Amino acid sequence: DAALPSWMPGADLPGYLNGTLPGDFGFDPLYLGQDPVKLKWYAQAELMNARFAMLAVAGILVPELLSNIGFSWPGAGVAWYDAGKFEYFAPASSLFGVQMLLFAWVEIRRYQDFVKPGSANQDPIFTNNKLPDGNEPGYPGGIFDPFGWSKGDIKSLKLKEIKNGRLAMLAFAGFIGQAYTTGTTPLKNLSTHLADPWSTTVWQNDLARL
Amino acid sequence: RQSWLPGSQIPAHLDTPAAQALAGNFGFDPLGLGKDPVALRWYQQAELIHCRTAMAGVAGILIPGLLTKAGALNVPEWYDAGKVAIENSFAPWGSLLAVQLFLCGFVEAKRWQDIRKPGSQGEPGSFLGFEASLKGTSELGYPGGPFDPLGLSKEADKWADWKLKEVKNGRLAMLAFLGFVAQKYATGAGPVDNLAAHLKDPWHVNYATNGVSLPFL
């Protein structure tokens, strides 16, 4: 509600969005972050869902692109939605069991910081090890920023993080929809479009499926 | 003031500050059942227990049903699950119900006595040292203590929102159970089938075409 960037040039934006969070373009048509305590939780949520979505999309597209090329390895042409039934060294169940244990420790360590900032910046075992005092929930830094990037224009870097994440979160949503609708991998869906974009729009595809 | 019917006259007994302190107060009491404050307090407790039981039961009918529809589960339909479970149980239904009434009656009596006099179950020396925790909070129907293991009720800036979600989700689950009973008698199928069938042809598959709900049309 000032002169900060807007999702719709000329609109009256919500005052609660004041440009303190990265990517504050005043977009809250349903007035969800109007309450400050909800907005505080939603900021971390958006950052967490974005950071996993960014890793996911990378780990979904890179292997497919390598598969198209001559790159050889166990996965090869394994479709992301078919990776679960793939046979690995250990039973899925076992792996999941380990994953939930390992994550219980890290999530509750991250959650402790969020509820009390700077309360989990110390190594439980090697007490001497720790994270620099200056810390905000969602931005642990220290050994999580091993190259010092945070030191430079941190605000621009945080905006690049939120922007790339929102696109990744939308990409994953695409992968889910396009996979269930076109029943094929994303880079295959892109090849179909690049071959004949005009005749390969969701409109025509869904019309044919009707 | 939110109203169940914009423009209608809200009962004065629901506009009183104490009544407005109650979660889900949309000024709805057309029959005037809660005009008496003492009755309004009993009915608020009754609504909370119905809400929390309906939410647990409906979750135990829909969630398993969707998982079975997918395949992750093979649970029988809610209206056939008693027979299936008792078929291979360690006890007949009558013995299982007798044990249920004993254990439920005991905890229901303690909750009852807490309504008659809040904090009474903390009577020192009444429960091998647990009575101290058996005392609820300043709000009847919200015991907390051991019943709030994660201490979410300790955040005063989120208390009201949490109670509104519990009452609204509870009122919805109460209506979803009535719907499960009515739809079972009018269709002869389960709630997940009823949903799929309607979604296939909503304009020809509904309660107006069930041959029961509207015997006049």
């Binding site: - | 029959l31 005037g32 059942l33 008496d36």
Partner: protein
């Protein structure tokens, strides 16, 4: 089953009564032309008779040696043997309607009593108020218990007139 009675569905007297009833209606249906309005009416009564004898038997009513349905009024026998729609359920249906009328009328008398001329509101009915109470009477049972528990339902003896004794 109970009292030595027999299901109307298996009673021979029940069957003979239905035939006897339909034969009277048929002896009369003859003197009339097939489409004649008299004929149509006798046919609809015959259909209604057939449905009654069938509906009563399906309801599991018991029949005495007279071949007529007998009603079981013991709550214990009715519930254990499937005869609760005969007297038990009807009892709670009537009690709800009768209490409805009583509680609404009591609420009306109490409301008009605080007016200028209660007697006038008894000869000329305050329709709007009467309609309001009529709709609010659905929850009378809970209201009656809440009044019984507040001690507001009854009147103090000290305020009620009596003869010298």
């Amino acid at each position: 089953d109970i009292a030595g009675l027999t299901p109307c569905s298996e009673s021979k007297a029940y069957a003979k009564l239905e035939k006897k009833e339909l034969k009277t209606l048929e002896k009369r249906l003859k003197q009339y032309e097939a489409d004649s309005a008299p004929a149509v009416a006798l046919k609809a009564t015959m259909e209604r008779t057939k449905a009654r004898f069938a509906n009563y038997a399906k309801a599991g009513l018991l029949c005495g040696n007279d071949g007529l349905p007998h009603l079981i009024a013991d709550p214990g026998l009715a519930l254990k043997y499937g005869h609760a729609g005969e007297v038990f359920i009807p009892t709670f249906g009537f009690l709800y309607v009768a209490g409805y009328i009583g509680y609404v009328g009591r609420q009306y008398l109490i409301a008009v009593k605080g007016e200028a001329k209660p007697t006038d509101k008894e000869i000329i009915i305050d329709v709007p108020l009467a309609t309001k109470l009529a709709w609010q009477g659905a929850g009378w049972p809970l209201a009656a218990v809440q009044e019984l528990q507040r001690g507001t339902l009854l009147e103090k003896e000290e305020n009620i007139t009596v003869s010298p004794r």
